[PDB]
């Protein structure tokens, strides 16, 4: 069984955060499991939000019971989290999980969906090369985007050795900026083509940027 979260990555303060968890494989209908939502707030540990049974019964964290509603659609292998009147304290990575059969441990988990609570508007990034001049360094600068996250791969995922994709920094403008670099043999700079693949799903931005050694 495999779980996957989906939903908006940006919610305005006081509005409603909504997320869906999709369960793959056999149908949850007829089953007897509980299904939980957990989040990791910005700079904090794990916090359990609540759970819903296959039959619809629910249990919520007492500190969140007035703002949270968790529901399930077993005919489509879905369950849902709704959290009202959100603030910046709800910015977090949200996880869905199936609960244990005999006790409320969590296995398996979803991949996690980042949700940011902010009044700021979505903005797609600009992708600039960091061109190389017996090992060279090259990369891409993914600048001025909101909200997180951005994903970067190299050469359609084939190039992974020596790749470092850095945590983004929030600029004074309120926009994020990130860099992704890779170290390669200098001898391959004229033979191998290097391309950074940048995905920013919140703005539906997709850039495949070729990084050429600067002619100088």
């Amino acid at each position: 069984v495999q779980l996957q979260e989906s939903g908006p990555g940006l919610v305005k303060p006081s509005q409603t955060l909504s997320l869906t968890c999709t369960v793959s494989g056999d149908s949850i209908s007829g089953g007897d499991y509980y299904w939980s939502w957990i989040r990791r707030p910005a700079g904090e540990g794990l916090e359990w939000i609540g759970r819903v049974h296959t039959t619809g019964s629910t249990d919520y964290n007492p500190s969140l019971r007035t703002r949270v509603t968790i529901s399930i659609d077993t005919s489509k292998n879905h369950f849902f989290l709704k959290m009202t009147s959100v603030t910046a304290a709800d910015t977090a990575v949200y996880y869905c999980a199936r609960e244990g059969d005999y006790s409320a441990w969590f296995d398996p988990w979803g991949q996690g969906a980042l949700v940011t609570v902010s009044s700021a508007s979505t903005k797609g990034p600009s992708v600039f090369p960091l061109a190389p001049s017996g090992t060279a360094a090259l990369g891409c600068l993914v600048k001025d985007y909101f909200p997180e996250p951005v994903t970067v791969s190299w050469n359609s995922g084939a190039l992974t050795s020596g790749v470092h994709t850095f945590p983004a920094v929030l600029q004074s403008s309120g926009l994020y900026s990130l860099s992704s670099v890779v170290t390669v043999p200098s001898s391959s700079l004229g033979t191998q083509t290097y391309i950074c693949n940048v995905n920013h799903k919140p703005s539906n931005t997709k850039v495949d940027k070729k990084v050429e050694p600067k002619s100088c």
Binding site: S36, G45, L46, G100, A104
Partner: peptide, 14 residues
């Protein structure tokens, strides 16, 4: 993480 009570489930700080 304790699974003794669900009101609420609680995690260690990590």
């Amino acid at each position: 993480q304790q699974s003794y009570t669900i009101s609420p489930i609680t995690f260690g700080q990590g």
